[PDB]
Amino acid sequence: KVFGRCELAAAMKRHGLDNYRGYSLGNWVCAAKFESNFNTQATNRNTDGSTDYGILQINSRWWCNDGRTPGSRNLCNIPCSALLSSDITASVNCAKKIVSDGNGMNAWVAWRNRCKGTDVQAWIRGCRL
Ligand code: NA
Numbered sequence: 483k484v485f486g487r488c489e490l491a492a493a494m495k496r497h498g499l500d501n502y503r504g505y506s507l508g509n510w511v512c513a514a515k516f517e518s519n520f521n522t523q524a525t526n527r528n529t530d531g532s533t534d535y536g537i538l539q540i541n542s543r544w545w546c547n548d549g550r551t552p553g554s555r556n557l558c559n560i561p562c563s564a565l566l567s568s569d570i571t572a573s574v575n576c577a578k579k580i581v582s583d584g585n586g587m588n589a590w591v592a593w594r595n596r597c598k599g600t601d602v603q604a605w606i607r608g609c610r611l
Protein backbone atom coordinates (compact mmCIF):
# COMPACT_ATOMS: atom_id res chain seq x y z
CA LYS A 483 0.00 0.00 0.00
CA VAL A 484 1.25 3.53 -0.83
CA PHE A 485 -0.14 5.84 1.90
CA GLY A 486 -1.01 9.45 1.48
CA ARG A 487 0.87 11.78 3.89
CA CYS A 488 -2.13 12.63 6.12
CA GLU A 489 -3.50 9.03 5.88
CA LEU A 490 -0.16 7.75 7.25
CA ALA A 491 -0.04 10.49 9.90
CA ALA A 492 -3.56 9.40 11.11
CA ALA A 493 -2.63 5.70 11.09
CA MET A 494 0.61 6.42 13.05
CA LYS A 495 -1.34 8.61 15.58
CA ARG A 496 -3.98 5.92 16.16
CA HIS A 497 -1.14 3.34 16.74
CA GLY A 498 0.37 5.65 19.46
CA LEU A 499 3.47 7.12 17.68
CA ASP A 500 2.65 10.83 18.27
CA ASN A 501 5.19 11.94 20.93
CA TYR A 502 6.30 8.28 21.48
CA ARG A 503 9.63 8.60 23.41
CA GLY A 504 9.17 12.36 22.80
CA TYR A 505 9.16 12.17 18.93
CA SER A 506 6.33 14.28 17.46
CA LEU A 507 4.23 12.69 14.68
CA GLY A 508 5.99 14.83 12.00
CA ASN A 509 9.30 13.01 12.84
CA TRP A 510 7.71 9.62 12.07
CA VAL A 511 6.04 10.86 8.85
CA CYS A 512 9.32 12.48 7.68
CA ALA A 513 11.22 9.25 8.44
CA ALA A 514 8.67 7.16 6.47
CA LYS A 515 8.80 9.60 3.55
CA PHE A 516 12.61 9.27 3.10
CA GLU A 517 12.79 5.58 4.06
CA SER A 518 9.97 4.16 1.84
CA ASN A 519 8.16 7.07 0.07
CA PHE A 520 5.17 5.86 2.22
CA ASN A 521 5.19 2.44 0.46
CA THR A 522 4.57 -0.54 2.81
CA GLN A 523 6.15 -2.89 0.17
CA ALA A 524 9.54 -1.14 0.07
CA THR A 525 12.60 -3.43 0.42
CA ASN A 526 16.28 -2.60 0.14
CA ARG A 527 19.44 -4.71 0.49
CA ASN A 528 22.21 -3.55 2.86
CA THR A 529 25.96 -4.01 2.20
CA ASP A 530 26.18 -6.48 5.16
CA GLY A 531 23.62 -8.86 3.50
CA SER A 532 20.68 -7.77 5.72
CA THR A 533 17.58 -6.21 4.15
CA ASP A 534 15.36 -3.24 5.21
CA TYR A 535 11.59 -3.80 5.11
CA GLY A 536 8.44 -1.71 4.96
CA ILE A 537 7.30 1.84 5.60
CA LEU A 538 10.14 2.48 8.16
CA GLN A 539 12.79 0.24 6.51
CA ILE A 540 13.30 -2.03 9.58
CA ASN A 541 16.37 -4.20 9.36
CA SER A 542 16.78 -8.01 9.38
CA ARG A 543 20.23 -7.68 11.11
CA TRP A 544 18.41 -7.03 14.46
CA TRP A 545 14.62 -6.80 14.26
CA CYS A 546 13.03 -9.47 12.06
CA ASN A 547 13.73 -12.85 10.48
CA ASP A 548 13.79 -13.02 6.62
CA GLY A 549 15.30 -16.55 6.45
CA ARG A 550 18.53 -15.25 4.77
CA THR A 551 20.41 -12.94 7.21
CA PRO A 552 23.08 -15.09 8.95
CA GLY A 553 24.25 -14.19 12.47
CA SER A 554 21.25 -11.89 12.99
CA ARG A 555 18.54 -11.31 15.67
CA ASN A 556 14.68 -11.17 15.50
CA LEU A 557 14.04 -8.74 18.42
CA CYS A 558 10.52 -7.86 17.19
CA ASN A 559 9.69 -11.64 16.98
CA ILE A 560 8.22 -11.33 13.43
CA PRO A 561 8.89 -12.49 9.90
CA CYS A 562 10.25 -9.53 7.91
CA SER A 563 7.33 -10.01 5.43
CA ALA A 564 4.95 -8.82 8.24
CA LEU A 565 6.56 -5.37 7.83
CA LEU A 566 5.26 -5.18 4.19
CA SER A 567 1.52 -5.44 5.07
CA SER A 568 -1.03 -2.72 4.17
CA ASP A 569 -1.69 -2.91 7.97
CA ILE A 570 1.20 -0.99 9.64
CA THR A 571 0.68 -2.53 13.14
CA ALA A 572 3.86 -4.71 13.03
CA SER A 573 6.03 -1.87 11.69
CA VAL A 574 4.69 0.52 14.41
CA ASN A 575 5.10 -1.94 17.29
CA CYS A 576 8.63 -2.87 16.08
CA ALA A 577 9.53 0.87 15.61
CA LYS A 578 8.54 1.48 19.28
CA LYS A 579 11.08 -1.21 20.36
CA ILE A 580 13.75 0.24 18.05
CA VAL A 581 13.33 3.89 19.19
CA SER A 582 13.54 2.61 22.85
CA ASP A 583 16.91 0.81 22.16
CA GLY A 584 19.13 3.81 23.31
CA ASN A 585 19.77 5.96 20.15
CA GLY A 586 16.19 7.17 19.68
CA MET A 587 15.31 7.96 16.08
CA ASN A 588 19.05 8.13 15.14
CA ALA A 589 18.50 4.37 14.53
CA TRP A 590 17.03 5.58 11.19
CA VAL A 591 19.98 7.19 9.31
CA ALA A 592 17.42 8.80 6.92
CA TRP A 593 15.80 10.51 9.96
CA ARG A 594 19.20 11.75 11.24
CA ASN A 595 20.28 12.99 7.77
CA ARG A 596 16.94 14.41 6.41
CA CYS A 597 14.55 15.06 9.29
CA LYS A 598 16.51 15.83 12.53
CA GLY A 599 16.86 19.61 12.98
CA THR A 600 14.30 20.43 10.25
CA ASP A 601 10.74 21.78 10.46
CA VAL A 602 9.13 18.31 10.68
CA GLN A 603 5.72 19.81 11.68
CA ALA A 604 5.48 20.61 7.91
CA TRP A 605 4.87 16.84 7.31
CA ILE A 606 1.48 16.95 9.20
CA ARG A 607 0.42 20.50 8.19
CA GLY A 608 -3.15 20.54 6.82
CA CYS A 609 -3.96 17.03 8.13
CA ARG A 610 -7.16 16.30 10.11
CA LEU A 611 -5.80 14.41 13.22
NA1 NA B 1 16.59 3.90 3.63
Ligand code: NA
Nearest residue numbers: 542546554555
Ligand atom coordinates in the same frame (compact mmCIF):
# COMPACT_ATOMS: atom_id res chain seq x y z
NA1 NA C 1 17.09 -11.35 11.66
Ligand SMILES: [Rh+]
Nearest residue numbers: 493497570571
Ligand atom coordinates in the same frame (compact mmCIF):
# COMPACT_ATOMS: atom_id res chain seq x y z
RH1 LIG D 1 -4.60 0.07 12.29
Ligand SMILES: [Rh+]
Nearest residue numbers: 495609610611
Ligand atom coordinates in the same frame (compact mmCIF):
# COMPACT_ATOMS: atom_id res chain seq x y z
RH1 LIG E 1 -8.08 15.56 16.67
